[PDB]
Give the backbone structure.
Amino acid sequence: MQRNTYNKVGLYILSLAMLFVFIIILTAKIPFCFTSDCSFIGLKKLVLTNIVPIVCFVFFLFSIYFYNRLKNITKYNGQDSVKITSCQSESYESLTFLATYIVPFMGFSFEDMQKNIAYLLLVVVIGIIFIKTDKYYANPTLALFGFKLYRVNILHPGSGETKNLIAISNDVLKVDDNVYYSFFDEFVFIARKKI
Amino acid sequence: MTTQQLKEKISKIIDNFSGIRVVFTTTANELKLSRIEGSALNSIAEGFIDKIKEDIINNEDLTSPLLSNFDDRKNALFKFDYEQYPEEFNKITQAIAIPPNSQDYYNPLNKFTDVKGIIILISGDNKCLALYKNKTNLAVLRNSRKMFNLVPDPDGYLKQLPNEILRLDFNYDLFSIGEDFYIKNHKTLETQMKFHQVIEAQAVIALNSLRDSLLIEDISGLEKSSREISFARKLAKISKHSPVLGKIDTKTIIDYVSQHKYLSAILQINEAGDKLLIKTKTSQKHFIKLMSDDYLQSDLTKIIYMSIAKDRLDE
Amino acid sequence: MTTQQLKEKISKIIDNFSGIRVVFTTTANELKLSRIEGSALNSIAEGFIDKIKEDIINNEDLTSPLLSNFDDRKNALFKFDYEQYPEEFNKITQAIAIPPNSQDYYNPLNKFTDVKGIIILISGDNKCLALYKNKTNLAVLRNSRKMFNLVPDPDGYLKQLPNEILRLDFNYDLFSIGEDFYIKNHKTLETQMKFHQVIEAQAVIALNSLRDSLLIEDISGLEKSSREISFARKLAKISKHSPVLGKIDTKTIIDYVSQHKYLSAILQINEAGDKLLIKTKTSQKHFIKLMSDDYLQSDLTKIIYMSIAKDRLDE
């Protein structure tokens, strides 16, 4: 509990950045008029008519902060290599996170606030089940930024081999393609492909 | 008996270098991995590779005798041939086989007071060599002064500010390759990890063998001198590799101290001509050095020398 | 100058300790007195007299030969005997004569980059014992990153904060009392004092003496081997303290090589039998250790030994 749960919640909040961008694009009632009589209505009613873009904006900065922490987990260590024995690509497990969990949110109508409370409860419930679901490495935001999620079986030079690890990486991997680890949990590590 | 095996192993380790990991050992005898910054870890890897190149790879005068054959020579890695492994060696061999997905990372809120030794796991070509170091109480590194009121502070007030920074120098005290241990600094053995009990037991066995050999008359001065570990180590080397104790008789030893130029002056014979009169500390250390065959004579020049360090050839 | 006299001098210095001061030599070769504070002076002085007592006073196995009789042995302070004094020797002999009211102070804005030598001046028995050490490549210390705002972060990394703060560890390179110098760290003698030109000059002098001895057909392997300082220190030892060069004729060394059990196999003799063939580095180091009078045979068990460290008893 706590720290491992907080790391997985951070990965989940990173997984939802494209949803917050889509909601901000979708239901922002910004008066985008270049006309001369389009004066400022005022900051108060501009805030009150754009409540869910403001909330999704705050959640977007939270996703940016958790991406910063995921880069901080690879800043410090990561000067040791392993050998890969069985590489199988699993980037599509990222994309099924999109088209089933982020795509049907935009079909909803974010007008009445009771429906928005229902959709926020749906986000919270999907998050609670998604922490312990063993497929928490699924990511639209990470797979957007060049990262590929592979299922590897690394082999250490001195300790031995470990089975069923998940490698987030920047370049393509294969068998005998030595990488540097920056282990996040006991399941997910960031590879770097020592040439 | 040679050094070419370790030289080839270290050539394969360094020339096919893969990675480095820093593992702290703790006073409660468990291992915690560390959180070294990557650029500083690259500097540490480069410096340790350079030191192990300047001491093993580029070195030509490197000899690897046995730890039981302790002599006072430099550039010598002592092979651990003793039958008992201490606790930190078992912890090193545990630290080699730590799986890489382990999550028992060290807590820097402990302020580096519980860490006893630093293990460095330099890896290359599917093998892992483990260097070891002792945190030498910060070796009291003084620091400069950055006074709060201004950034350059042109006033010399240099004091050690934090008292909790880790030293981590570039001198290693012992290391392990494969299933073998090599030892550089024996003060780390004696003081930190308490190796002197086995040496004192071997000195006790040496005193028992010296009583049974009936070469000395009074052994109480030697039993008093056996308390010092600097004497107990050479009594242990007498107990293991004395080439004249038990293989040749006592009478030729009495003759050899009789008609010697130096040894007749200090190492005295008794009135019965069968036991030696060795009471003083100079006579004691001369007795010890004669057991190690250090009064050693030339052939081309025919000059007797005091051989502090010697070996039985076979290169 | 014997070892016991130096031990008595150091004991009289330590038992009558009076004062302590720290001097810096920079890259522009001037002596600047630092501003190190009194409690830190007490701590550094206590640790340094502890190091001296463990290195000289409580060390019961000290020998003090000259650097021209150099060999790789531990626990020994090699007394300087060469005629040519380096510039830092002149700097430290000026440093022991620095008055206590000198105003040549250290500017703390230099960022500790110009300073290349540290001087510890201990005082006892109206004597000033000088310890000279250098500055290494900072021997980097590590700080846990307490930089969120002020004081939290039990997850941060260890990274090098200062990159300019000097260390002043508990180690010395050389120490001098009176007009007597002793060197413990010869590596910083060879590389930082630029002493390797003098050792190379002694090496080519010994090579010319080898050509005068009419013993070697071709010194080309010895010529390309003398560029490394490891062969050059033994070449200087051959130039000064070898009892074979200039004393024993060529035919006697050839005959003793011929009937030797190990030297005849490696150090082969030519077709005419007038010189000795030497081409490989194994034969090179074997000729070096043969001319240095180290293949020495036991007078008791008749075992030949390779003496890495030897001392003359009659002198």
Notes: The first helix of chain B runs from residue 4 to 15.
